Ligand binder design. Structure first.
Ligand SMILES: O[C@@H]1[C@@H](O)[C@H](O[C@@H]2CO[C@@H](O)[C@H](O)[C@H]2O)OC[C@H]1O
Ligand SMILES: O[C@@H]1[C@@H](O)[C@H](O[C@@H]2CO[C@@H](O)[C@H](O)[C@H]2O)OC[C@H]1O
Lengths: 398, 398
């Protein structure tokens, strides 16, 4: 039994389908192995995984985002270096976009096999709401503000926001810092320099966020709305909100929970430009993918590799596409017209392919011991407990 | 039953004696436990420990230096947080100097039990050589360079130096940066800002090292001379070198290897002051102690804790003292009269108690993913492959 610890949101249905398919397979018989999904709820996944990895019953494979989400496990000797496994296995070697495999590497060694869709953060919107108020998707920050003022007036919350998890608030900072100051601002911080939080682009992003909040862009009480229980996506699908800045898994989430809305009334656009900003507007922030990594303590390394091969298969790729995701397998590009929404799938594939920079979600990119302290300070910014200068000063002390 | 992975230099005799004592004690049968030392050679200890921690046979407790030597294991969920264990257990609670327990801590949580001596780096010297050439230990850098010239004139290598391991070279940089720029210089770097390598004090120290190498202060073969096999201590004991900059375990090393020399002819002094420097001249660098940490996977935590209480005992304290170490147990200071050299033991105790700052060895203090590449660059500086400027630029690139 290969245990696979996985992030248990609605998307886990794809991995459930894969465990079933693999378990019934001849490659499985061959390695005398079955996979068992250990589903861990989204809301406390990083802590639960850490506890499990220190336990006698640590998972044989586990779900991650690369970067800071594996750096400690790797430094602690807990991971199998997959570089040679991937190189010598024909299916693994040619199975994924090389850029996505690189995003699951550390120090030039590959530690992840891609296992969900590419996940850039996009601006989604309700096309009904817009049509009713003669709004158009904003190509600039000033137009985004115009849209906020009109929705406010019309009694519609401009943006849905899952304040509870705090990382949905972080998304605003991520795009703002990149648009304003380009990718080198966060690169410096991610590499460990806390002084880097002193960059003027960070302060400008933090002030811009405060203005949005103070001026009602997220309404009142977003700090009590959750993304993970479906609350924030439902605000959008019911036309209680006009827009929603979210990882591209939002489309899948909408399709499964509100299919009528997702089919007819869900729109999308890139995060807008910001006047005077130095960042290339083609840059994206989010998650290049999610990855399986393999525990160095595992007793059936070959069984686990066998299951990992399935991640490159036509059947796995089709299951992702049918879910609303755009997979990172080499065969996916040629299969996008099979998507529930081929225009969206194609918009999303090319947005990522054209991006000069793809910045990993900050709470997954920073060193693990910064992840929570950082989200704590972001929440204090959003609820107005910290001024933008206090926010900067707190982070400089990490 | 409890495996203990330990750094296997000559000092490991004290831990073998502890295992013998514990395994024969009533406390060990009470806790249903025995301990087995898994001795790992000094030269590749951090790598072998990392491989073992990722193995199905990971040790129940293991030797470390605190700081970066545990940061990854802690972040990876591999350690028991000892804070409450320590607080609840009378013997552990009052058994150690609180400053030493703090230096086994991360993020305010205690992960280490002290288990060797306090280990400031000191300048040792051969008193027979110094008497023959009418030298006195240097209190300033100018006196040190006068001593360098006179010892060269006498045909004696001025400093023994174990170039092979590289960290004995690092000691020179550590005290030179601290004396020149103060502890703030390395604090900046340790906390993860690689641009901190650009501080003028780093370049000045690197320049200073180069000058020492170029003028023959370490003679010509030092890159092939080992500390861990005894080669560097032997050069001092035999009077082939006049001085040796080393962690205070050098006293114990000498007493074990060259007892007549250690009894009669070994001198010690603090690292000298430095003209033009800004660092507090009392500051020290080295290891506050070594620690046991406990694997979060351990099946018999109570057996492990019973062995850890021995580290606070009078017997373990006396075994350290008799070895030539100065223990960090609360019972130790009034027992230093039992030391093979009470004068030195007291000197060392006071030097550490008076130091405004005690910087952890850099290769143990920095994040584990910087440790070997930093040592690689220190080596290139000492053997002349990198100029001071190239050394600074390479380290900036970490
Ligand atoms: O920390 C945050 C992650 O929790 C978030 O994770 C994504 C949530 O949706 C799942 O369907 C995706 O697989 C998963 O990657 O990404 C944002 C990050 O800030
Ligand atoms: O990385 C280096 C360590 O290997 C060195 O460790 C000391 C060696 O002597 C042993 O007797 C001590 O217990 C141990 O701490 O410390 C210096 C550091 O740079």
């Amino acid at each position: 039994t290969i245990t696979a610890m996985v992030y248990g949101d609605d998307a886990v249905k794809v991995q459930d389908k894969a465990a079933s398919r693999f378990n019934a397979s001849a490659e499985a018989k061959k390695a005398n192995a079955k996979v068992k999904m250990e589903r861990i709820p989204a809301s406390d996944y990083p802590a639960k995984l850490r506890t499990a990895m220190g336990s006698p019953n640590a998972p044989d494979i586990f779900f991650n985002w690369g970067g800071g989400s594996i750096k400690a496990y790797k430094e602690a000797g807990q991971l199998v270096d997959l570089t040679d496994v991937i190189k010598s296995d024909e299916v693994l070697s040619t199975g994924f976009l090389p850029s996505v495999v690189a995003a699951g590497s550390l120090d030039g060694h590959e530690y992840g096999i891609p296992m969900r869709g590419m996940q850039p953060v996009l601006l989604f919107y309700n096309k009904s709401v817009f049509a009713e108020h003669k709004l158009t998707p904003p190509t600039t920050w000033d137009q985004l503000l115009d849209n906020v003022a009109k929705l406010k007036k019309a009694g519609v919350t401009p943006f849905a926001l899952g304040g509870v998890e705090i990382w949905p608030e972080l998304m605003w900072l991520e795009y703002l810092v990149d648009r304003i100051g380009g990718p080198q601002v966060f690169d410096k911080i991610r590499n460990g320099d806390a002084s880097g939080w002193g960059d003027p682009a960070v302060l400008k992003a933090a002030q811009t966020v405060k203005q949005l909040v103070d001026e009602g862009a997220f309404g009142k009480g977003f700090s009590s709305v959750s993304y993970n229980n479906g609350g924030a996506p439902a605000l959008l699908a019911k036309g209680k909100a006009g827009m929603h800045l979210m990882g591209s898994w939002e489309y899948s989430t909408q399709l499964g929970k509100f299919p009528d809305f997702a089919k007819k009334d869900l729109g999308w656009c890139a995060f807008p430009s910001f006047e005077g900003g130095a960042g290339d507007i083609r840059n994206v922030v989010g998650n290049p993918c999610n990855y399986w990594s393999v525990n160095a303590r595992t007793g059936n390394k070959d069984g686990a590799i066998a299951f990992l091969r399935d991640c490159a298969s036509e059947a796995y790729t089709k299951d992702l596409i049918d879910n609303g995701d755009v997979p990172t397998t080499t065969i996916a590009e040629n299969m996008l017209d099979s998507s529930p929404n081929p225009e969206f799938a194609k918009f999303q594939y090319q947005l990522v392919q054209k991006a000069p920079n793809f910045t990993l979600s900050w709470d997954q990119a920073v060193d693990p011991d910064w992840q929570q302290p950082m989200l704590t300070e972001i929440n204090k910014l959003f609820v107005g407990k910290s001024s933008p200068e206090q926010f900067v000063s707190a982070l400089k002390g990490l």
